[PDB]
RNA sequence: UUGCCUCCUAAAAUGUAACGGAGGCGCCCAAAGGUUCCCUCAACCUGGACGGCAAUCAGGUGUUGAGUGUAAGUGCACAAGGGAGCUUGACUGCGAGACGGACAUGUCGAGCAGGGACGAAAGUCGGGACUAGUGAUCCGGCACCUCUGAGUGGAAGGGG
RNA sequence: UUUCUUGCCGGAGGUAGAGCUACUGGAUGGCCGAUGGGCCCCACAGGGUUACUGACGUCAGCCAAACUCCGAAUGCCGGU
C-alpha cells in the first residue's frame, strides 16, 4: 500500500509510456532481481501483493529491495454519471513501468528458493518478466 | 457534483519578434518579455514594460557577455 | 598628548610578552582587541515601549554616548511580535572609549560582583570571541540605585583579532579578567 | 468611500486642471504639491478643491 | 461560469479549445515619487543572570540560500536593497519611428522650447522593478477663454 | 517575380531525451552518530552498562505537464 505522503498537485494527465527504460536498468543493491519486458501500469496494490508473496515464501532470511514507487495518480468517475462535467476523484496510485526496468531485488544465499520466490512474485504481476543476476 | 476551476487569461503574444541579421527601423521594438531575459546593449533602450527596442538603424546582433543575453544594433554601412 | 594606561600596558609589555611566549614569525601577529559593543534587548516592548526610553537613559549614563533603537527582521505570531517594533538598545565602544570602558569595568564592576567565582575558560568558540550576560545591571558606579525601577540588562563585551583559542587564552590572561582555574 | 476623487485647481487663473486619488483616512490635511499650469507658463503650486 | 491578470496543458517564433489542472484582481503610496551620496545580507560557533531552541551580539568560512507593498511569473548583490540631505517631472507643447490589432482598443520612444528638482558639472527627471486594480453611447454640471450671438449693442441662448 | 523551392551564412528558444552532493517535491537500504536536536539508575560523571530515535555527512539507485546545473531533429524570421 505504497502511497506518497503528499503531492504538489493531486491530478495529472495521461503519462507517456513510450521508449526503453534507461534508469535502473542494471541491478545493484544485492545479488538477484527481476526485470520486466512490456509497457504497463503497475499499481500499489500489485506491489503490496508481490511483496507479501516474496516475504510469505522467503520467510526468515534475506531482505527485499523495491526500485519503484507508485506515486502517479489516476482518476475515475463513478458509474451512472454523464461524461464530462470535470475530472473524477483519484482512486488508485500507479507506477508506470518501462521495459527492462528492475522491479524487485533479492539477496538470499541459495539459487533454488531464490528463483522460486522470484517466480512467485512473477506470477502475481500483470506483465512478463525474467530473473536477472548480479553477474552481467 | 461540479468543478470550480476553468477560468483563464488572455494571451499578450509575448516573445522575440525581431531576429538577428535583418534590418530594422528607428524605434523598432525587438523583444517583448516580462523580466530581463535579454539585456540592452549599444543603441538599445528599455521600455516601461521591460521591452527592448532599437535607437539606431542597422542590423540586430545577439550575443553573450558575462553570462548574459544582450542585443545590439550594428551600424550597417551606407551604400 | 594623552594615552590610556591599558593601551600603554599593551604597547609596552603585553605585546612583547606574547611575541616571546608564542614565537611568532613577525611582530604584529600579536592579537589585539578590536571592538567593544554594548547593548541589550528588553523583549517586552511588544506590550510596552515606555521602558525603552529608560533603557536608553541607562545606556546613556553607562557609555555617555547616545544608543540606538532597532526593529525585528522577522514576525513571530507565537511571541505576539511583528516586524517594526523597536526591540532593544545598541551602542558601541571604539578606541579611547574602548580603553576607558575596559578600565572602568575591570577596576570597578568585577571586584564588586555579588558572589563572584570568576569566569570559566571554556566559553570561547575556538577563535577567541566572548560575549556573555550578568546578574545585575546597576553595578557601575556611574548609575545611581535610587532611580531604578526594574531590573534591565546591560553589556560588557571584549573581542580579539585572535586566530584561535591559544592566543585568546594568552592575551585574556595577560589582561587579567577573573578566569577560573580547573 | 475610502478613495475620494479630488481635483487640483490653480490659483492665479483658477483652473481645475489636474485630478488625483487619495485616502482621506490617512490624509486628513489638504494636498500641497507643485505642478505646471499650461496657460500660466510657469510652475505654480496647486491646491485641491 | 460569463470581465481582467499568473502558470501548465500549448507539440523549443506568435497563436491554439474543452464544464481541463491551480490561484488572485475592482488597491495603496504625499511617499513606497525624484536627484545624489554612505553601506550589504540571511545561514554561521560561543556565551558577564534573566535572555531560554530563537530577543540583540561582536569576532570573522559566508556570491544569495535574508529579501525587493498586494497571487503567479522574470529578474535584481553591477541592485529595482536600507538610510540620509534636499525637493515634486505623478511637467507643459509635442512627437520621428515602431509593437500591436476584423473594428472601436493597449505599449515604448531619442529630440526640440518655457520654468524648475538633485549634483560643482557631467548627467537623470513624461508616476511607482514589470505584467491584473477596470466600462463604449446619450443626457446633465462647473471654472476660464481677444468663439458665435436669429433685424441695431448686445445679452440670453448656443460654443470651446 | 517583390512569391515558392533548395544550398550556405547570422540568430533566441526550451519541447523529445537525460540528469541530480544542482534548485522545488517524491523515494529505497546501510555506515560514525557525538548530540531523541535526549532517557537503567537524573550527580556536576559509566549506556538502549538496554531492542528506540537517530540530525548533519556519506555510500549508491529512481520518479515529476506547472523542477531544469543540460538539451537536439523539426518549424519559424531575415539575407545571399
Ligand atoms: Mg535517471
Ligand atoms: Mg504479468
Ligand atoms: Mg511605468
Ligand atoms: Mg519608472
Ligand atoms: Mg577571530
Ligand atoms: Mg490633464
Ligand atoms: Mg503564461
Ligand atoms: Mg510560444
Ligand atoms: Mg478555436
Ligand atoms: Mg476568484
Ligand atoms: Mg526616496
Ligand atoms: Mg562580529
Ligand atoms: Mg525606486
Ligand atoms: Mg534604498
Ligand atoms: Mg508617428
Ligand atoms: Mg526623454
Ligand atoms: Mg530645457
Ligand atoms: Mg442610449
Ligand atoms: Mg434683433
Ligand atoms: Mg439684439
Ligand atoms: Mg456663454
Ligand atoms: Mg529575383
Ligand atoms: Mg541553429
Ligand atoms: Mg543556443
Ligand atoms: Mg521557463
Ligand atoms: Mg520527458
Ligand atoms: Mg536538492
Ligand atoms: Mg545509477
Ligand atoms: Mg505531456
Ligand atoms: Mg522539463
Ligand atoms: Mg512550434
Ligand atoms: Mg530562407
Ligand atoms: Zn494657472
XYZ file of C-alpha atoms (C1' of nucleotides) and ligand atoms in Angstrom:
719
model
C 0.000 0.000 0.000
C 2.675 2.453 -1.096
C 1.251 5.985 -1.248
C 3.239 9.218 -1.359
C 2.766 11.387 1.711
C 1.855 14.494 -0.280
C 1.949 15.702 -3.871
C 2.107 19.305 -5.038
C -0.760 18.711 -7.480
C -3.283 15.925 -6.972
C -4.243 15.213 -10.614
C -2.042 14.570 -13.650
C -2.635 13.928 -17.344
C -2.195 10.573 -19.042
C 1.519 9.750 -18.727
C 3.605 8.952 -21.759
C 4.712 5.320 -21.750
C 6.985 5.258 -24.799
C 10.620 4.283 -25.103
C 13.011 1.942 -23.337
C 13.881 2.352 -19.666
C 17.294 3.945 -19.134
C 17.388 4.473 -15.376
C 17.540 1.457 -13.112
C 18.382 -0.882 -15.993
C 21.029 -2.796 -14.011
C 20.533 -4.462 -10.639
C 22.910 -3.377 -7.875
C 21.705 -3.454 -4.316
C 22.019 -7.201 -3.787
C 22.516 -10.297 -5.917
C 19.217 -11.160 -7.620
C 16.477 -9.160 -9.301
C 13.513 -9.170 -11.664
C 13.392 -7.332 -14.993
C 10.184 -6.552 -16.877
C 9.569 -6.824 -20.602
C 6.484 -4.860 -21.676
C 4.886 -1.468 -21.009
C 2.428 -1.497 -18.123
C 0.718 0.323 -15.281
C 1.793 -1.402 -12.048
C -0.363 -0.419 -9.077
C 0.453 -0.050 -5.398
C -1.875 -2.933 -4.544
C 0.050 -5.096 -7.017
C 3.325 -4.025 -5.377
C 1.897 -4.867 -1.947
C 0.683 -8.277 -3.113
C 4.025 -9.065 -4.752
C 5.993 -8.027 -1.659
C 3.664 -10.111 0.511
C 4.275 -13.031 -1.845
C 8.060 -12.645 -1.681
C 8.215 -12.456 2.118
C 5.492 -15.103 2.512
C 7.854 -17.563 0.804
C 11.348 -16.387 1.789
C 10.415 -16.449 5.499
C 13.346 -15.894 7.848
C 16.441 -14.916 5.881
C 17.073 -12.363 3.171
C 15.552 -8.968 2.539
C 13.778 -7.152 -0.279
C 14.521 -4.019 -2.293
C 11.859 -2.260 -4.357
C 13.132 0.024 -7.118
C 9.753 1.593 -7.986
C 7.218 3.715 -6.108
C 3.529 4.035 -7.165
C 3.036 7.796 -6.975
C 1.383 8.500 -10.337
C -2.356 9.006 -9.720
C -5.331 8.108 -11.892
C -8.906 9.390 -11.787
C -12.210 7.624 -12.391
C -15.715 8.862 -12.310
C -18.321 6.711 -10.556
C -20.820 4.953 -12.788
C -24.247 6.401 -13.635
C -22.668 9.778 -14.380
C -22.682 11.564 -17.716
C -19.219 12.057 -19.132
C -17.645 15.468 -18.737
C -18.540 17.970 -16.019
C -14.967 17.996 -14.683
C -12.432 15.423 -13.580
C -13.154 12.477 -11.313
C -11.586 11.735 -7.975
C -8.338 9.712 -7.875
C -8.842 6.072 -6.921
C -5.553 4.172 -7.210
C -1.970 5.396 -7.482
C 0.152 3.649 -10.108
C 3.829 3.421 -11.035
C 4.408 3.482 -14.781
C 6.987 0.816 -15.637
C 9.102 0.833 -18.793
C 10.562 -2.302 -20.415
C 13.691 -3.716 -18.822
C 13.217 -1.843 -15.553
C 14.144 -3.723 -12.374
C 11.097 -4.190 -10.141
C 12.237 -6.183 -7.094
C 15.665 -7.146 -5.789
C 16.598 -10.068 -3.553
C 19.707 -11.162 -1.662
C 19.376 -14.728 -0.389
C 22.037 -17.475 -0.364
C 20.591 -20.337 -2.392
C 19.530 -20.341 -6.037
C 16.700 -22.835 -5.550
C 14.363 -20.889 -3.285
C 15.735 -17.579 -4.561
C 14.448 -18.329 -8.066
C 11.357 -19.945 -6.540
C 10.375 -16.779 -4.661
C 11.215 -14.562 -7.629
C 8.892 -16.718 -9.753
C 6.268 -16.491 -7.008
C 6.435 -12.723 -7.459
C 6.426 -13.109 -11.260
C 3.133 -14.996 -11.224
C 1.366 -12.093 -9.473
C 2.485 -9.299 -11.847
C 0.371 -8.449 -14.920
C 3.260 -8.479 -17.431
C 6.081 -10.791 -18.441
C 9.339 -10.633 -16.513
C 12.570 -12.586 -16.145
C 15.174 -13.391 -13.497
C 18.432 -11.431 -13.626
C 21.552 -11.959 -11.526
C 24.262 -9.579 -10.365
C 26.649 -11.040 -12.918
C 26.039 -9.403 -16.276
C -21.052 17.474 -8.411
C -19.304 20.230 -10.368
C -15.944 21.931 -10.898
C -14.685 25.253 -9.539
C -11.795 25.699 -11.991
C -11.898 26.551 -15.689
C -11.078 30.264 -15.913
C -8.072 31.627 -17.782
C -6.462 34.839 -19.010
C -5.817 36.229 -22.477
C -2.591 35.876 -24.475
C -0.483 39.010 -24.854
C 1.609 37.469 -27.638
C 4.980 37.872 -25.950
C 8.356 36.788 -27.225
C 11.159 37.831 -29.518
C 9.770 39.061 -32.834
C 12.867 40.558 -34.462
C 15.800 38.225 -35.064
C 19.453 38.779 -35.821
C 20.841 39.501 -39.261
C 17.917 41.580 -40.529
C 17.473 45.339 -40.910
C 15.212 47.253 -38.530
C 13.813 50.766 -38.451
C 14.389 53.526 -35.938
C 12.468 52.917 -32.738
C 11.758 49.329 -33.778
C 10.687 47.054 -30.923
C 12.780 43.882 -30.768
C 11.693 41.702 -27.830
C 8.618 41.584 -25.604
C 9.406 39.925 -22.283
C 8.302 40.051 -18.665
C 11.679 40.353 -16.930
C 15.274 40.595 -18.103
C 15.625 37.540 -20.308
C 17.565 39.842 -22.640
C 19.593 42.918 -21.766
C 20.168 46.174 -23.653
C 23.484 46.843 -25.329
C 24.540 49.588 -27.714
C 21.659 51.571 -29.237
C 19.098 49.516 -27.266
C 16.578 51.081 -24.903
C 14.251 49.661 -22.276
C 10.555 50.457 -22.035
C 8.254 50.644 -19.058
C 7.209 47.009 -19.525
C 10.772 45.623 -19.885
C 10.607 45.572 -23.678
C 13.669 46.088 -25.860
C 13.807 48.375 -28.886
C 16.355 49.945 -31.220
C 17.607 53.538 -31.140
C 19.573 53.498 -34.402
C 19.313 51.964 -37.881
C 21.236 48.806 -38.604
C 21.201 45.061 -38.057
C 20.322 43.260 -34.838
C 23.025 41.025 -33.385
C 22.539 38.727 -30.407
C 25.493 37.909 -28.200
C 26.705 36.691 -24.833
C 28.578 38.938 -22.409
C 29.480 37.702 -18.905
C 26.729 35.124 -18.565
C 24.047 37.347 -20.105
C 21.954 37.661 -23.247
C 22.391 41.083 -24.845
C 21.177 42.541 -28.136
C 22.973 45.118 -30.273
C 22.363 47.089 -33.456
C 25.482 47.416 -35.598
C 25.840 50.481 -37.858
C 25.455 48.805 -41.251
C 27.491 50.573 -43.922
C 25.748 53.173 -46.059
C 25.638 52.107 -49.763
C 49.252 64.358 24.359
C 47.214 61.683 26.147
C 47.265 57.884 26.052
C 45.305 55.365 28.158
C 47.069 53.230 30.730
C 45.768 49.915 29.366
C 46.881 50.875 25.852
C 50.274 51.772 27.348
C 50.480 48.387 29.070
C 49.560 46.651 25.813
C 52.140 48.522 23.743
C 54.933 48.153 26.331
C 54.802 44.671 27.858
C 51.769 42.694 26.670
C 52.752 42.535 23.003
C 56.387 41.677 23.717
C 55.359 39.004 26.229
C 53.010 37.427 23.680
C 55.640 37.686 20.943
C 58.314 35.935 23.015
C 55.949 33.354 24.504
C 54.455 32.076 21.202
C 57.451 32.978 18.981
C 55.538 34.406 16.032
C 57.194 34.787 12.638
C 56.598 38.556 12.717
C 55.753 41.109 15.380
C 52.179 42.197 14.684
C 50.799 38.654 14.856
C 50.158 39.803 18.426
C 46.380 39.593 18.835
C 44.591 42.812 19.677
C 41.248 43.970 20.999
C 39.038 45.044 18.115
C 35.620 46.433 19.127
C 33.524 46.813 22.265
C 29.761 46.575 21.796
C 27.229 47.408 24.498
C 23.521 46.619 24.120
C 20.550 44.610 25.358
C 17.035 43.683 24.238
C 14.110 44.136 26.600
C 11.681 41.944 24.648
C 8.575 43.343 26.371
C 8.380 46.334 24.016
C 5.673 44.356 22.198
C 3.452 45.194 25.187
C 5.013 48.433 26.454
C 7.577 50.633 24.710
C 7.803 53.217 27.508
C 10.687 51.408 29.238
C 12.740 51.635 26.030
C 13.368 55.281 26.928
C 14.505 54.231 30.396
C 16.862 51.699 28.834
C 18.200 54.462 26.576
C 18.779 56.666 29.630
C 20.584 53.814 31.408
C 22.829 53.210 28.391
C 23.425 56.965 28.156
C 24.738 57.097 31.721
C 26.754 53.916 31.173
C 28.631 54.819 27.969
C 27.984 58.565 27.696
C 27.040 58.390 24.008
C 23.561 58.002 22.523
C 22.179 54.475 21.898
C 20.062 53.051 19.054
C 16.558 51.692 18.529
C 16.305 48.840 16.006
C 13.454 46.633 14.813
C 12.932 42.891 14.296
C 13.666 41.378 10.881
C 11.064 38.615 11.310
C 7.499 38.317 12.588
C 6.646 35.767 15.286
C 2.916 35.367 15.874
C 3.666 32.991 18.757
C 5.509 35.777 20.610
C 2.917 38.389 19.533
C 5.757 40.066 17.643
C 5.716 41.504 14.126
C 8.284 43.464 12.151
C 8.510 47.104 13.171
C 8.702 47.392 16.883
C 11.983 48.507 18.463
C 13.219 45.568 20.500
C 16.320 46.678 22.433
C 19.159 49.173 22.643
C 22.542 49.435 20.896
C 25.795 51.300 21.425
C 29.422 50.532 20.625
C 32.697 51.476 22.325
C 35.649 52.080 19.994
C 39.185 53.348 20.534
C 39.842 55.513 23.554
C 36.277 54.726 24.571
C 37.125 51.003 24.497
C 40.135 51.530 26.735
C 38.355 53.803 29.223
C 35.336 51.482 29.431
C 37.518 48.382 29.848
C 39.390 50.180 32.629
C 36.135 51.141 34.339
C 34.766 47.602 34.080
C 37.863 45.713 35.251
C 38.536 48.177 38.058
C 35.042 48.839 39.419
C 32.478 46.209 38.452
C 34.289 42.859 38.558
C 35.634 43.351 42.126
C 32.130 44.306 43.310
C 30.223 41.373 41.732
C 27.870 39.787 44.247
C 29.160 36.239 44.799
C 31.879 36.389 42.125
C 33.524 32.999 41.496
C 35.438 34.070 38.379
C 34.797 33.224 34.745
C 35.374 29.858 33.119
C 37.849 29.491 30.217
C 35.537 27.273 28.120
C 33.234 29.937 26.653
C 35.270 30.720 23.535
C 34.176 29.463 20.113
C 37.657 28.395 19.005
C 38.992 31.725 17.715
C 38.816 33.896 20.833
C 35.398 35.550 20.919
C 33.444 36.247 24.063
C 30.049 37.864 24.711
C 28.008 36.959 27.695
C 25.493 38.175 30.373
C 25.248 39.459 34.020
C 23.276 39.062 37.261
C 22.518 42.780 37.900
C 22.671 45.906 35.743
C 23.003 48.745 38.337
C 26.555 47.647 39.022
C 28.570 50.535 37.573
C 29.215 53.467 39.858
C 28.102 55.937 37.177
C 24.471 54.825 37.664
C 22.516 55.569 40.844
C 20.441 52.935 42.626
C 17.656 55.223 43.864
C 16.253 55.992 40.393
C 15.970 52.411 39.088
C 12.511 50.840 38.899
C 13.033 47.392 37.326
C 15.989 45.112 36.575
C 17.009 45.542 32.933
C 20.110 44.413 31.044
C 23.443 45.971 30.087
C 26.632 44.964 28.321
C 30.373 44.389 28.781
C 31.933 42.787 25.701
C 35.554 42.119 24.731
C 36.673 40.625 21.403
C 40.053 39.779 19.847
C 41.797 39.662 16.482
C 42.878 36.193 17.627
C 43.203 33.435 15.047
C 42.427 30.683 17.566
C 41.999 29.785 21.229
C 45.660 29.666 22.305
C 46.367 33.391 21.981
C 42.866 34.072 23.242
C 43.847 32.359 26.488
C 47.195 34.140 26.499
C 46.026 37.723 25.958
C 42.892 37.475 28.091
C 45.019 36.119 30.972
C 47.677 38.789 30.448
C 44.989 41.460 30.640
C 43.722 39.753 33.761
C 39.972 39.181 33.966
C 38.954 36.723 36.737
C 39.379 33.449 34.871
C 38.514 30.323 36.838
C 41.010 27.508 37.407
C 40.019 23.932 36.575
C -15.700 55.748 0.204
C -12.044 55.300 1.212
C -10.870 56.711 -2.146
C -12.326 60.170 -2.808
C -11.520 61.673 -6.180
C -10.086 65.153 -5.655
C -9.251 67.700 -8.346
C -6.320 70.124 -8.237
C -7.028 73.769 -9.047
C -4.684 76.599 -9.953
C -4.538 79.949 -8.149
C -3.685 82.845 -10.474
C -6.006 81.709 -13.269
C -8.022 79.264 -11.119
C -8.429 76.319 -13.499
C -9.280 72.808 -12.315
C -6.500 71.214 -14.350
C -5.354 68.028 -12.605
C -7.212 65.298 -10.721
C -5.782 62.653 -8.381
C -6.928 59.976 -5.916
C -6.172 59.945 -2.192
C -7.107 58.256 1.085
C -8.901 60.634 3.441
C -8.283 58.377 6.447
C -4.517 58.721 6.074
C -4.501 62.297 4.693
C -6.989 64.488 6.583
C -4.972 67.551 5.567
C -5.221 69.179 2.159
C -2.910 68.185 -0.677
C 0.049 70.503 -1.302
C 2.279 69.852 -4.323
C 3.641 71.795 -7.299
C 2.644 71.309 -10.934
C 2.834 73.206 -14.209
C -0.301 75.050 -15.321
C -0.336 75.273 -19.137
C -1.817 78.755 -19.570
C 0.330 80.345 -16.853
C 3.662 79.468 -18.466
C 5.444 78.766 -15.167
C 5.210 76.184 -12.405
C 2.851 77.227 -9.616
C 1.723 75.140 -6.626
C -1.742 73.598 -6.860
C -4.350 73.363 -4.104
C -7.038 70.691 -4.062
C -10.697 71.708 -4.039
C -19.285 30.243 -15.236
C -19.808 34.849 -18.249
C -14.677 40.708 -17.223
C -9.309 41.044 -16.343
C -4.300 39.093 -14.617
C -0.187 34.338 -13.396
C 1.473 29.227 -14.860
C 0.679 24.419 -17.379
C -1.939 21.706 -20.909
C 0.485 24.573 -25.802
C 3.964 19.774 -29.747
C 11.548 24.806 -28.318
C 8.533 32.150 -33.496
C 3.146 34.235 -32.289
C -1.144 31.965 -31.661
C -4.134 27.477 -30.361
C -10.157 24.772 -27.253
C -12.829 21.982 -23.597
C -18.000 22.033 -17.535
C -9.069 20.685 -18.222
C -5.430 21.433 -13.806
C -4.008 25.514 -9.854
C -4.647 30.915 -7.754
C -5.851 36.072 -7.489
C -7.841 41.389 -9.040
C -12.408 46.339 -8.977
C -5.970 48.783 -4.131
C -2.078 51.516 -1.847
C 1.786 55.250 -1.625
C 2.305 62.992 -0.438
C 5.520 58.819 -0.155
C 6.515 53.115 -1.267
C 7.874 59.849 -6.271
C 12.838 62.106 -7.953
C 18.272 63.601 -7.551
C 22.774 62.453 -5.213
C 25.610 60.098 -1.695
C 27.045 56.126 2.591
C 26.828 50.876 3.311
C 25.324 44.815 2.323
C 22.894 40.274 3.984
C 20.496 35.771 5.905
C 22.895 30.521 7.002
C 27.071 30.513 10.916
C 30.271 28.621 16.661
C 30.243 30.845 21.573
C 28.041 32.741 25.509
C 29.076 38.850 32.000
C 21.610 36.418 35.192
C 17.189 36.527 33.488
C 17.586 36.199 27.984
C 15.989 30.203 27.050
C 15.708 26.429 20.885
C 15.295 31.628 18.868
C 15.428 38.626 21.503
C 20.373 41.995 20.260
C 25.504 40.458 19.557
C 30.922 41.218 18.184
C 34.742 38.341 16.244
C 35.076 36.598 11.323
C 34.285 30.401 6.393
C 29.519 33.462 4.250
C 28.182 35.325 -4.188
C 22.332 34.983 -2.325
C 20.161 30.186 0.307
C 17.508 37.067 4.102
C 14.902 39.964 0.982
C 12.811 43.743 -3.282
C 3.654 46.525 -0.868
C -0.649 43.312 -2.703
C -1.240 35.778 -6.375
C 1.904 33.787 -10.109
C 5.813 34.709 -13.467
C 11.038 37.310 -14.767
C 14.785 39.315 -12.652
C 17.526 42.254 -9.219
C 24.103 41.511 -4.833
C 26.536 45.577 -11.327
C 20.698 46.138 -7.162
C 14.775 47.552 -8.614
C 18.009 46.750 -1.005
C 18.355 50.064 3.792
C 19.324 55.154 5.379
C 20.253 60.201 4.920
C 20.324 65.684 2.712
C 17.075 68.445 -0.468
C 12.739 68.664 -3.358
C 7.980 67.475 -6.605
C 8.734 65.663 -13.979
C 2.534 61.899 -10.785
C 5.643 68.780 -16.174
C 3.667 71.660 -20.236
C 3.620 71.638 -26.358
C 4.561 67.681 -28.715
C 6.185 63.824 -31.162
C 10.485 60.765 -35.522
C 9.537 55.824 -35.778
C 7.686 51.455 -34.100
C 4.977 46.806 -31.433
C 0.003 45.727 -31.565
C -4.555 44.803 -33.660
C -11.608 42.048 -38.058
C -13.090 47.356 -35.693
C -13.722 50.655 -31.550
C -8.769 49.457 -28.011
C -3.462 48.934 -25.299
C 2.676 49.705 -25.149
C 7.660 52.298 -25.946
C 10.336 56.052 -27.564
C 15.598 59.783 -28.678
C 14.996 65.108 -29.641
C 13.468 70.454 -29.514
C 11.135 75.481 -26.411
C 9.467 77.579 -21.040
C 10.167 77.020 -15.914
C 12.071 74.059 -12.435
C 14.305 69.300 -8.903
C 19.247 66.936 -7.424
C 24.583 67.453 -8.143
C 30.130 71.795 -8.944
C 29.426 69.648 -13.525
C 28.960 65.629 -16.302
C 24.473 63.540 -16.056
C 18.956 61.833 -14.613
C 13.733 63.569 -14.102
C 6.764 62.499 -19.433
C 4.435 58.145 -11.632
C 5.626 53.521 -8.609
C 11.406 46.853 -10.900
C 7.430 44.949 -14.519
C 2.848 42.318 -16.035
C -4.233 42.441 -13.179
C -6.771 47.314 -9.662
C -11.357 48.146 -14.962
C -16.728 50.499 -18.770
C -18.392 52.420 -25.239
C -23.041 55.939 -26.416
C -26.752 59.712 -24.960
C -28.039 63.307 -21.471
C -26.998 66.670 -17.442
C -22.783 70.446 -14.005
C -18.640 73.854 -13.021
C -14.244 77.316 -13.730
C -11.774 80.218 -17.534
C -11.488 81.900 -22.861
C -9.272 88.560 -27.916
C -15.626 81.779 -30.020
C -20.964 82.911 -32.027
C -24.762 85.861 -30.667
C -31.952 84.726 -35.310
C -33.035 92.900 -37.715
C -29.481 97.854 -34.173
C -25.381 96.975 -28.821
C -25.749 93.110 -27.086
C -27.055 89.746 -23.882
C -29.821 85.337 -23.323
C -29.264 81.175 -25.986
C -25.597 78.407 -28.348
C -19.681 77.199 -28.117
C -14.806 75.646 -26.677
C 8.886 37.790 -59.512
C 8.598 41.527 -54.912
C 6.154 34.973 -54.430
C 7.880 29.488 -53.912
C 11.649 25.739 -53.509
C 16.633 24.391 -52.321
C 22.426 25.052 -50.650
C 25.103 28.173 -47.398
C 25.638 32.094 -43.959
C 23.675 35.198 -38.773
C 20.203 34.097 -34.963
C 16.749 33.287 -29.458
C 14.305 29.386 -27.693
C 13.065 25.492 -24.261
C 9.517 20.655 -26.392
C 11.868 14.870 -27.084
C 15.559 12.713 -24.253
C 18.648 12.585 -19.872
C 20.021 14.112 -15.058
C 20.578 15.377 -9.983
C 26.349 16.286 -3.216
C 22.365 21.496 -8.774
C 17.150 24.072 -7.032
C 11.078 22.864 -5.699
C 8.729 17.803 -4.170
C 8.522 12.185 -4.138
C 11.577 7.548 -2.625
C 14.817 2.562 -1.129
C 18.658 0.155 2.153
C 23.336 0.887 5.184
C 27.718 3.419 7.990
C 30.298 7.240 12.656
C 26.483 9.200 15.005
C 28.928 12.981 19.335
C 24.342 15.249 20.403
C 15.509 11.603 20.728
C 18.203 18.155 18.276
C 17.807 13.189 24.692
C 16.192 8.769 28.634
C 18.629 1.844 33.826
C 19.834 4.434 37.511
C 18.571 12.176 36.870
C 25.002 13.926 40.241
C 28.263 18.291 38.012
C 30.261 11.550 35.739
C 29.504 4.881 33.215
C 24.769 3.258 28.107
C 19.451 1.381 24.540
C 26.156 -0.763 31.253
C 19.338 -1.866 27.431
C 15.749 -3.642 21.256
C 14.449 3.065 20.180
C 15.102 7.935 17.979
C 18.983 8.928 15.498
C 20.337 15.220 12.629
C 24.424 16.646 9.617
C 27.516 13.804 6.271
C 28.203 9.721 3.194
C 27.640 5.163 0.132
C 24.665 4.165 -4.154
C 19.858 3.532 -7.356
C 14.746 6.086 -9.350
C 10.360 9.434 -10.354
C 7.703 14.722 -11.675
C 2.772 18.881 -17.683
C 3.067 23.677 -13.567
C 11.817 21.051 -11.482
C 15.875 22.437 -15.371
C 23.191 22.805 -13.416
C 21.789 20.444 -19.835
C 19.459 19.937 -24.425
C 18.509 18.024 -30.341
C 15.533 16.766 -35.197
C 11.631 19.951 -36.907
C 9.175 24.634 -37.693
C 9.514 29.902 -37.707
C 12.092 35.165 -39.058
C 15.887 37.763 -42.065
C 19.954 37.943 -46.097
C 22.653 35.841 -50.268
Mg 17.635 8.864 -14.418
Mg 2.247 -10.460 -15.526
Mg 5.601 52.948 -15.563
Mg 9.972 54.185 -13.961
Mg 38.714 35.801 15.104
Mg -4.612 66.717 -17.565
Mg 1.803 32.348 -19.267
Mg 5.408 30.110 -27.584
Mg -10.777 27.727 -31.880
Mg -11.836 34.219 -7.530
Mg 13.240 58.285 -1.622
Mg 31.042 40.464 14.988
Mg 12.894 53.294 -6.759
Mg 17.047 52.028 -0.511
Mg 4.371 58.563 -35.908
Mg 13.373 61.840 -22.831
Mg 15.436 72.826 -21.319
Mg -28.672 55.220 -25.473
Mg -32.950 91.996 -33.039
Mg -30.108 92.132 -30.207
Mg -21.515 81.819 -22.531
Mg 14.571 37.807 -58.393
Mg 20.646 26.568 -35.020
Mg 21.694 28.317 -28.402
Mg 10.578 28.953 -18.342
Mg 10.409 13.592 -20.677
Mg 18.461 19.223 -3.906
Mg 22.524 4.577 -11.100
Mg 2.892 15.823 -21.626
Mg 11.083 19.915 -18.144
Mg 6.259 25.297 -32.619
Mg 15.289 31.175 -46.130
Zn -2.870 78.526 -13.834
